[PDB]
Subunit: 275 residues, 6 copies
Amino acid sequence: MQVEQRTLNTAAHPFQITAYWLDQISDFETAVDYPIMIICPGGGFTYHSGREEAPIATRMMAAGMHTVVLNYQLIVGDQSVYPWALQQLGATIDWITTQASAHHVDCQRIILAGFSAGGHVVATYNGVATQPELRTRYHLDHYQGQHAAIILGYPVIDLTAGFPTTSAARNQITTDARLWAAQRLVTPASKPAFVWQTATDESVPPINSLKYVQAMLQHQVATAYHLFGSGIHGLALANHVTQKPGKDKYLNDQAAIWPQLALRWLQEQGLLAGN
Amino acid sequence: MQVEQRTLNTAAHPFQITAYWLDQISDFETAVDYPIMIICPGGGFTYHSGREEAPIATRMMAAGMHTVVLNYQLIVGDQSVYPWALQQLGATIDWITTQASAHHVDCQRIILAGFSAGGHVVATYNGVATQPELRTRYHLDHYQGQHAAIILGYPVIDLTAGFPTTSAARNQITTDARLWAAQRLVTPASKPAFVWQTATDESVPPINSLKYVQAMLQHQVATAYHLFGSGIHGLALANHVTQKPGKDKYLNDQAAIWPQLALRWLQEQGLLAGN
Amino acid sequence: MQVEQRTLNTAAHPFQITAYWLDQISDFETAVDYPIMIICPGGGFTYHSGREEAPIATRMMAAGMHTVVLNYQLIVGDQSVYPWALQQLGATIDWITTQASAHHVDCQRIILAGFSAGGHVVATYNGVATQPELRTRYHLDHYQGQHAAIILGYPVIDLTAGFPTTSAARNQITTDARLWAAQRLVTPASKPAFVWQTATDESVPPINSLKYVQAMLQHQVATAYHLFGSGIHGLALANHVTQKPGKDKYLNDQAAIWPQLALRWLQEQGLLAGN
Amino acid sequence: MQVEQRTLNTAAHPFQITAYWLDQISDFETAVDYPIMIICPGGGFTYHSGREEAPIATRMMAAGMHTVVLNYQLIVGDQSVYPWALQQLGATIDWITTQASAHHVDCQRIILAGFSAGGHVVATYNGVATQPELRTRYHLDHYQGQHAAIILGYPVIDLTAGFPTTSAARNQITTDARLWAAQRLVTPASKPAFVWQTATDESVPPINSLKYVQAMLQHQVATAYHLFGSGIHGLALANHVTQKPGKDKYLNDQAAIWPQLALRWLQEQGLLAGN
Amino acid sequence: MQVEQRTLNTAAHPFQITAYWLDQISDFETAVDYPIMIICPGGGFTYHSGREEAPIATRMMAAGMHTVVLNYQLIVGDQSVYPWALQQLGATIDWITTQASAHHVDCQRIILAGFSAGGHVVATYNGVATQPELRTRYHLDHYQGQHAAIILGYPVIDLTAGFPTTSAARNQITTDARLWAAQRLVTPASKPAFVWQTATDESVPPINSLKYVQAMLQHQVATAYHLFGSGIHGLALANHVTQKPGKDKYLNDQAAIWPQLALRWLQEQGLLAGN
Amino acid sequence: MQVEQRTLNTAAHPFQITAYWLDQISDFETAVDYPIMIICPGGGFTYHSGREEAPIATRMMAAGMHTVVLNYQLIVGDQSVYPWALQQLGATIDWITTQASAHHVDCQRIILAGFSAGGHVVATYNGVATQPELRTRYHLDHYQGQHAAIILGYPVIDLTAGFPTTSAARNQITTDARLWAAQRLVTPASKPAFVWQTATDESVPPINSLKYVQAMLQHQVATAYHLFGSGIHGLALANHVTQKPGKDKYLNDQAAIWPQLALRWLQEQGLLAGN
Ligand SMILES: CC(=O)Oc1ccccc1
Ligand SMILES: CC(=O)Oc1ccccc1
Ligand SMILES: CC(=O)Oc1ccccc1
Ligand SMILES: CC(=O)Oc1ccccc1
Ligand SMILES: CC(=O)Oc1ccccc1
């Protein structure tokens, strides 16, 4: 295993990635290209949550994929998230295509994963980067490669749907209301989505995931949805690894099955080797 | 996540380790010390099998533990595995104690994992390093730190018990017949052992694991044993990650549950945080 | 000790830092969080002077603090220093807060040090970043963390006060005269300043430092000031370490005591462990 | 030998370089400063061709020079190449001057190599960076150092001269027609050029290189030109190293002597040590 | 291109290597396995000469091969060169086999290159490692992989043949006289040898190379030999790259063609891709 | 500043070093060779004390020298300290000579610093490595380079002189009593020594330094000695940097002047640039 931390400069706003590369198993007689997952964590658009970075990447690497963590555009200075964060995703996928041979990446198996705020970028991107009208508007044109599916964990999907609370916090995120709500952007072009959330999510009401999934079916898009009964927002892995020390509310054994559900779903979709 | 690859020189035969350090999560308020697992892979004493190195490390690391892979003494040159391989383990545990504060290692939770030939070293060590008589005999004296438990996967336990096939290959492994068989070395002071193997193991006969568990019980040491019904030798993870490309015999979905079994077992022993 | 060199992208103009991290002492039974000093060297806004980077960092590291060298915005292309350089400082402090647990940084003990042209950035920042009005104007809002004190060595404080020599050179630094003079930016909210300069400073008139201290006191901010009697501009450490080879005019034994004065002043401020 | 990969932030558009530094020979009793070659590969302004990076840098390194590969501005997002790419070259040369002491670089011996699209940037730069009229217009002022010579392999010199085909592709490269054609930008100020191309270049008509040389003589700049008889576009080293697997058309043994011709030409100019 | 510097511990005397790995070209739609050359420099058995390390490795790398520099056993402390250096060579080849898949090494194309004292190790190894009686005697048994050919530049072949001078120097190198002379070790199992030397070699008489070739033929091993008319010992590349500053005697344009001769010879042996 | 961690294999027992290299100052017109200090920490021959590694290295680095920390042979396995540790010092000095050109090391200014147990190795080495009789006997022959002076801080000088307490502990350190006591090894060939200790040293009675200093004047070798009136063993820097958290007994302001005293002592010896 190798770890690469790096600035990519091929977008208007340069950004940092952290790639975790799988190494070839040395006593294999032949080579294998592995899938790769790009993770956009949460942190409410003002920071990148560590709980949703390495611990999630490591769990997915365990199942045999490369992973990359994208530090997408935050609110800092008077900066807005969009349209920049969308462009950084496109550049990250592009950059991956250039690294394929060196790292044995299966470019037909590029997965994006978003959590909370992170989910908005990915949900939007699955929307935006699947319609050339919105591609051009947002300058995702001229980037190589594309993603095969998305995974969304308790995603922000609609900025008027409870998060963020105050109007003045919507606006920081963006004064472009044409993507306050990722549900309205779904077309039959959108790539297959695995979605999960808790029903008891106070900070990001489940209608977000419902609305995306609802809209995912209404345009015939292969989608799976798990709304677990209990659990607070931001469970991450919902187990001791991502548990804030001494805070039981981060433990939820029912939600903790999601990575297994996710991986099995990726296999079904032909996007991960089956055993 | 950092990757450290390094020679340790505090043994008669210097040796390489590869450490994979967990990084602290930044959204945490307080620091956490994590367990560490040292892995001795298989390879029939002539090599170190990559199938049982990083893939296994990553899976254990996904559960929230540091891991280190130890290139124990092989048959190379007119060299024998023992007693050097034992000293290298002690040196590795020692080295961990000196890295504990920089990496947040919980030294009361140092776990050893052995696979196949690698299991002999760990099994022997579990015996030798808990008996001052054999400690001193084999030069493990003056090393800091101790391991809390072992994990053995399809472990070579007795060199007269099938592997190796010829008498000339077992000699190469060692002239010292006082540890051809680790099942004879087991005494009360030994640390708890989680053991698994398949029953249809041609290469390394199940009597090996049976004999060792027999002796852990006939000696009152907390233990656990899983002998799956089917499967060839060297399953590793028994899934697509460790599957030699196109070889179905490396898939066994029943055996594939062993890491979960092992993690839950560690949690029960209070050697890994629980859920 | 670890050396991290790195681009930070969380500002309008991305920029390089070079971080020098203290490692934990391994025979300490418990962990210690250390203070951190951010250094902005001189170079007359057209370069970053090496004499005021590592040699100064190492002397400060020897007293038990992390250090980071910041390559603030220079005059290059047709770029001005301001307001960008101010933002880069805010982002660096912010970045530090995110690295605190991994490196054991005491974020309550963040010190900024500026030299010559570098002092302007720091002196201005100390004023700007303690006033929401000037904060917001210059886009320092939304960044985490704050500095506890500043250190200024022969600082450029007023752009009309002799440096730079020509009209055409002032302007290249900035077409914003509301920052030509950091002495006018001084208000009571400011963090405490240790200031030193030589009286015979031909290149940057002592009126600069004198004006700043004059305003630190008139606004009741804790300040200490050493105006040494002899010596040219840019003494740095004023000894053989930073002495341009064969040039005695860089040696000044009286000025050479400043790091000691500064460290004791920091201890007095409760911003460094006392011995 | 050392390999440095890194972002430089001293341009409006930050960018990656990959520097390959020569190490001092240890049994030399005195040090030696080595020339350095900056390489801008081709890729038709939409990517950076690996065929024209490392394999070319390694060949030039074998003759005793440092090399740096410059990832100049491409067409990505709605971005055009110019004027940004010209600034990135200036910042790279500038950065080199700042590394000269640590790496023993002879700043009197900075050479630029451009291939295909990369050649346009180098050819244009050679024009722009020698005339302060076009210097100022394109924002190259305040950057230290200067190049002593260029090398152009099958360079794009004129955008209306066959490449790019469509008009829509012209424009993506630039809506500044003023430098669609580096031929008409040559003055006596220009640095000496070694130029080569094949006569049968379908993709980028030979008239391109012909025009630049024609212009290089008509304003009398020391120059040398090799238009080989056979060979497709993008030969690179024109041997097995840069040969696309199983594609004979990338082999051309007459063109393959170009690195020798170039090196001898550099020795002639006093830009490389001689034999 | 990546540079790996590392201790290998798989011999009685552990030892450092410096590997220079070629990176795959990202434009190639398929992958390519490259040959690899192990280089044993000279230094008269008391040091490793830098003139014969990187400079030579870089020239060979430019031709499209991986290279590794082996720091073989010297006369240091009280040690003799043999039989350890032979084991270190075997362990290095072995290590390469384990790196083959991660770096795309063609294990049927492993070439050994020795210079001066380094040449003795290579020449002897070519003999020893091609004879199981002498294989075993010297403990090269149990190591994987083997080399396809050797290259010898002004090699030490016989220790009584003028190098080393005094009796007391030969003995330091080794008291085992059975391989004072690599000519006698030659048998038809020996891999093919490209050999070169100058006839005016005062330091190491030409009869050395003469005798080895003289025996490669009389044992029907494919071999080529170039004895240049002029030139001192230790020409290395015989050009400005390996020339001691201000020392013309290191220049020799006739001998300087040797790397081209060797590469063509390798192509002829099907050991390097042809043009 | 660069940090190099590394195994050296040119001794019977390979060993780790950690080198801290000063970087050249970029705004110097000329280059400068700096002195280098090799540090052997204490730890009572069973471990290397972190209190006496980096913190001391950093403080010496601040004065403008390279530093290297040597992990000399410990009591581990059934291994003794001697004669191995002496060889390791020799190889380290030797290795430095091979790195001089690359790092600008002034090989005429190599200084050894030992603390407590580490002092014994340095003190003995000072004795052994200056007399060819003991040189040959202990196999320091054939290593290049030599040291100019030693620094000893509360050194163990005689193993009967209190430390270690029991006869069982001394013997572990070594059976060879011909260097239980470095005071008896002092002859006038020895390089100059700066020596310090506290009078109240319980664990290692002042007798040791006194006995060494006494013995050092009697062979007319330039020396300096400081015996502070208070303070326990192992003060290191005797300040807050090396203070065990909450343990005042590690603070001693009088002894804390020793680095300054030592540096000024090196200046008069002409082994460090003077200011
Ligand atoms: C225990 C050891 O080999 O020494 C060190 C010291 C600092 C960091 C890593 C290793
Ligand atoms: C820029 C940032 O905060 O991302 C990280 C996170 C952990 C380690 C290094 C960088
Ligand atoms: C054009 C280029 O060099 O792209 C990269 C970037 C990082 C690593 C390898 C290749
Ligand atoms: C010139 C500058 O300050 O950037 C650096 C810093 C350290 C090393 C290399 C480049
Ligand atoms: C002396 C040695 O082990 O080899 C080298 C040489 C140059 C740089 C690094 C290692």
